[PDB]
Design a protein around this ligand. Structure first.
Ligand SMILES: Nc1ncnc2c1nc(Br)n2CCCCBr
Ligand SMILES: Nc1ncnc2c1nc(Br)n2CCCCBr
Ligand SMILES: Nc1ncnc2c1nc(Br)n2CCCCBr
Ligand SMILES: Nc1ncnc2c1nc(Br)n2CCCCBr
Lengths: 261, 261, 261, 261
C-alpha cells in the first residue's frame, strides 16, 4: 500500500517521521507522495489541513490519520507514543474508516472558482464595509451588514465557528452551519443573529450590494477575490476519510480540548 | 376520513371552527375527536402544542395542520383566509405529508416517566442552585452549574432555544440541540458554553449532584419531579406528520417571523 | 473598638474564628455582635453576603473584611494564613477604607418595600410568562418578554451578572447594570438585547403588564411578591466600607478568579 | 460668533447648508472654518465624525451640533425641519453645553503616536493571527488570541461596540469599555470573554507577542502600524462639547434607534 507522511517541520516532528518511515520499511509499504493511499500528518490540526488540501483531488482514495506532537487536536488526535503501534495496524490493513462531510464554496465572476473546505469558509470586506444579501434556496433571507460571515463544516464547528457563538455538531450530521461576525442590528437594519444549520442540497448564496471585492477565506487560505458576482455555499458531495484504529468519540475530543485533559 | 378541530377559545377562532365544520359537512368527513385522522388547530403555535400533546398516542395516524388567527406561527402557518380552500383539498385527500423529528425525555426514580416534546424540554432548579453532571453516550462531559439546560427539537430551535443563543436548524435534520442558561464559568468551574447538536441514537443523560428535585418542563408543561435519579434525552423514534398542501419553506417561515413580513 | 466575626459553620472556619477571637483578646477589642465596628467574615463571598445583610442598618459605621477558607472570593479575598497578621493591624487601627456603591430596590403595592443589594437584584416570573414595561427616567424604553432581568452592582458584575453576558466594571464607577434573561425577539416583539449601565440618580422602573406577581430576588434572598405595582431600581445613597490593609486590585481579583491562579 | 457647517455632500445636505448660511447671514455670525466656535454637521453620525476629527485640536473651544438628513443618529440627532429654529437660538447664544468623554490611544515604536477617538479604537491582525498580552495598570491580565479588540467611548458603545456584545453606558459615565472579537478559548488558551469597563486614569496596555504589525483603527480611520511596541488605552483628558438647545435623553436616542421610532 502506498503512503506518505507530512511533518510540521520542527525537530520532534521530523524525527518522528523518519522513525515511522523506517518502521514502514519493515513491511510492504512504498513511500509515495504523488498517489498515496494513507496520508499521515505529524504536528497538529494545521499540519493536517495542509495535508488535506494538497491531496483534495484524491479524497476518495486516501485514508487520513493525524498525530499531534503538541496539544490534542481534533484531526491530529493520536499521541506520538502511539506511532509504533500505529504503523503496524496501518501496514496490516483490515482497519475501519470514518467519513466527515465537506463544504463546497463556489465563486462566480463577470469565470468560476470552486473550493473545498475542511473547517470553514469565511467572507470579509476589503477595506470598507461589508454588505451582502443572503439567499437560501433562491429565496432572499436577509441583508447582512457586519464584519463577515462564516460557513463551517461539522468538524469545523470546534474551530473558528465556535469563537463566533456557533454550535458544536457531531461530524456524522451531513450539514453546514453559518455564523455572523459583529452584525449591525438597529431599527432599520435587521439580521437573524442566530446561527443557521443547513442540511444537504441546501444552497446558501451570498450576493453583493455595492463592493464586489471580498476577502474570501478557505481554511488557512485567504485570497482577495475581485468583481465577485455571487458566493455559493452547500454541503460538498465529497467526504474526507479517516483511518479508524481506535475509539476516540467526538464528544470525547471536545471534552479534552475545552473542559480539561 | 375522521377529523377534529381545536380552537384557541376566543371569538374569531371559535367562529372559524364552526365554519370549517359546516364546510366539512358538505363532504364525507366525520367530526371525531376520539380517533381522528386530521387534526386542525385554529389560533397559534400554542394552540398547536395542545393539539399535538392530546393526540401524541396516535402520532403515526394523524396529519396535523395549523391555522394562525394572530401573527404567523411556525406550526400554525396558514392564514384564516385560506380556510375554505383548506377544507376542500383536505376533504379530497391526495395531499402530501412532511414529518418532523421529536424529542424523547426519560426520567428515572428510586419508577420511570417518558415524555414527548415538540419544541423543547427544560430542566431548572427547585429553589436552590442547579448542578448536574452531563453524560454523553455514557461518557461524562461536564459538570454544569447555572440556571438550567434546554434540549430542543429542530422545529423547536426557533422557540425558547433561540432566546438562549442556540442555532436554528432545518427540521429535516433528525437531531436535537442542547443549550445552557447563565452557566457559571470561573477558574474552577468550567462549562462548554457553546450549544451542542446531537444526531439520532445519541443519548444525553443528566445526573444530579446534590438536590434530586428539578423543575422539569416539556413544551408548555412544567412539573416539579421529586427524587430524580437521571434525566435521559435522545431523538424520539416517533415523528409528527404535517399535511402539506402548499410550499412554505422553513427558512421562509423564519424570514417572516424574525426579519419582517 | 467593637468587633464581631461570622463563620461559614464548617470545621476550619469555626476554628479560625476562635483563634482570631483569642488573638483579639490580647488587645483592647470587645467582641460585640450588636453594635460592632469591624465585621469579619470567614468562609466565602456567600458568608460575606450574610454578614453584610445582617448589618445593613449600620453600613456607615462598619468596615468589612473577608477571609476565604476555600477558593478566592471577591469580598473574602484574604487567605487564612494572613489572619494572625490581620488581627494586629485591625487592632492597632490606622488602616484605610474603600467603598463600593450599592443598589436600592423599591417595590410598591396597592404599601412599599425597600431593599439593599450588594451583588444584584433579580425579577423572574411566577409560573407563567414574564412581561414587563421598562421605564428609564419616566420614559418608556421597551416591553421586555423573557425569563427575567438582573440589575447588578459594580462589585456584583462578576457574579450572576457575568453569566448573563453582562460586562465587568470597576467598583469605583458609581453605577448599576441591567442584563436580560433569554429575551424573546421576533418581528413583533423587540428588546434591546445589550446590557445597560446606568449612572447615579438614574431610576429604572419595571411595570407589570398582566401578572402582578414576580419572584423578586435580592442577593441570596428570593421572595415571591404579590400584587406588585412597580419595581424601582437606582444606585443607593449608601455604600459598603471595606477595611483596606493591602493592595489587591479589582482586575487582580478578576484575573485570579477567571483566568487562573 | 464664528461658525462653520459641514455637509455630507449629497443634494439635500448641501442645500440645507446654504439655507442655514443665508439664515446666519441675518445675524452677527461669521462663517469661519479655520477657527470656528460652532461646528454644524449636516448628514449623519459619519458626517459628524469627520467634523469632530478635523477640529480635534480646538475641542475646548467648539460646541458641536448634528443634523441628520437620513435616519436618526446619536450625534446628528436633530431633524432637518428644526434647522431654521436651530440657527436662531445658536445665533443669540445663551444655550447650554453637555460634554462626553473621549478615548486617548497611544502607540509606541522602536517614536510615539497619540490619537483621539469619539466612538472606538480597534486593533486587528495584519494577515496572520492576532495574539497580544493585555496589561491593566501595569498588571498582566490575559493573553488574548482572536480576531481583535475594541475599546469604545461611552457614546461609542451604541456603535461597533454594541455589535460585539458590549454594554451600552450613559455618556455621563467617564469611562471606557473593552470588547473582544471571536476570542479562542480552549483548555490551554483562556480569555475573560466578558466586556470590561474601565474608569478614568485606568491604563489598558496591549503588548505584542510575535507579529509587531496591527491594523489599528480610530473611528473611521484604519491604518496599518509597523513595529509596534505597545498600544496604550485610557480615558482622554479632553471632552467633546455639544450645544444643548433641547431635551433629547440618551436612553431616548437608544430607544428610537434600536426599538422603533
Ligand atoms: N476544528 C478545529 N478545532 C480545534 N482547533 C483547530 C481546528 N482547526 C484548526 Br487549523 N485548529 C487549530 C490548529 C492547532 C495548531 Br497546529
Ligand atoms: N417553535 C416556535 N417558534 C416560534 N414561536 C413559538 C414556537 N413554539 C411556540 Br409555543 N411559540 C409561541 C406561540 C405563540 C402564541 Br399562540
Ligand atoms: N460578586 C461575586 N463574584 C464571584 N463569586 C461570587 C460573587 N458573589 C457571590 Br455569593 N459569589 C459566590 C460565593 C462563593 C461560595 Br461561599
Ligand atoms: N455611536 C454610533 N451609534 C450609532 N450609529 C453610529 C455611531 N457612530 C457611527 Br459612524 N454610526 C453610523 C453612522 C451612520 C451613517 Br452617516
Amino acid at each position: 500500500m502506498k503512503y506518505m507522511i507530512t511533518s510540521k517541520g520542527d525537530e520532534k516532528s521530523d524525527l518522528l517521521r523518519l522513525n515511522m518511515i523506517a518502521g514502514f520499511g519493515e513491511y510492504d509499504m512504498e513511500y509515495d507522495d504523488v498517489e498515496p493511499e494513507i496520508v499521515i500528518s505529524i504536528g497538529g490540526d494545521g499540519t493536517f489541513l495542509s495535508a488535506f488540501h494538497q491531496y483534495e483531488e484524491r479524497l476518495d482514495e486516501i485514508a487520513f490519520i493525524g498525530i499531534h506532537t503538541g496539544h490534542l487536536g481534533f484531526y491530529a488526535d493520536w499521541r506520538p507514543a502511539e506511532a509504533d503501534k500505529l504503523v503496524k495496524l496501518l501496514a496490516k490493513g483490515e482497519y475501519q474508516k470514518v467519513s466527515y462531510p465537506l463544504l463546497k464554496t463556489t465563486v462566480k465572476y463577470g469565470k468560476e472558482a470552486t473550493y473545498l473546505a475542511l473547517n470553514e469558509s469565511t467572507v470579509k470586506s476589503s477595506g470598507g464595509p461589508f454588505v451582502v444579501d443572503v439567499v437560501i434556496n433562491d429565496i432572499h433571507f436577509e441583508r447582512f451588514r457586519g464584519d463577515g460571515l462564516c460557513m463551517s463544516t461539522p468538524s469545523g464547528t470546534t474551530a473558528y465557528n465556535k469563537s463566533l457563538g456557533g454550535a458544536l455538531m457531531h461530524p456524522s450530521i451531513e450539514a453546514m452551519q453559518l455564523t455572523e461576525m459583529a452584525s449591525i442590528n438597529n431599527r432599520v437594519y435587521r439580521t437573524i443573529g442566530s446561527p443557521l444549520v443547513f442540511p444537504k442540497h441546501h444552497v446558501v448564496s451570498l450576493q453583493p450590494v455595492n463592493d464586489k471585492d471580498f476577502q474570501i477565506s478557505v481554511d488557512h487560505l485567504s485570497i482577495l477575490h475581485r468583481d465577485v458576482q455571487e458566493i455559493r455555499y452547500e454541503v460538498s458531495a465529497k467526504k474526507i476519510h479517516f483511518a479508524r484504529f481506535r475509539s476516540f468519540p467526538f464528544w470525547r475530543r471536545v471534552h479534552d480540548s475545552f473542559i480539561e485533559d
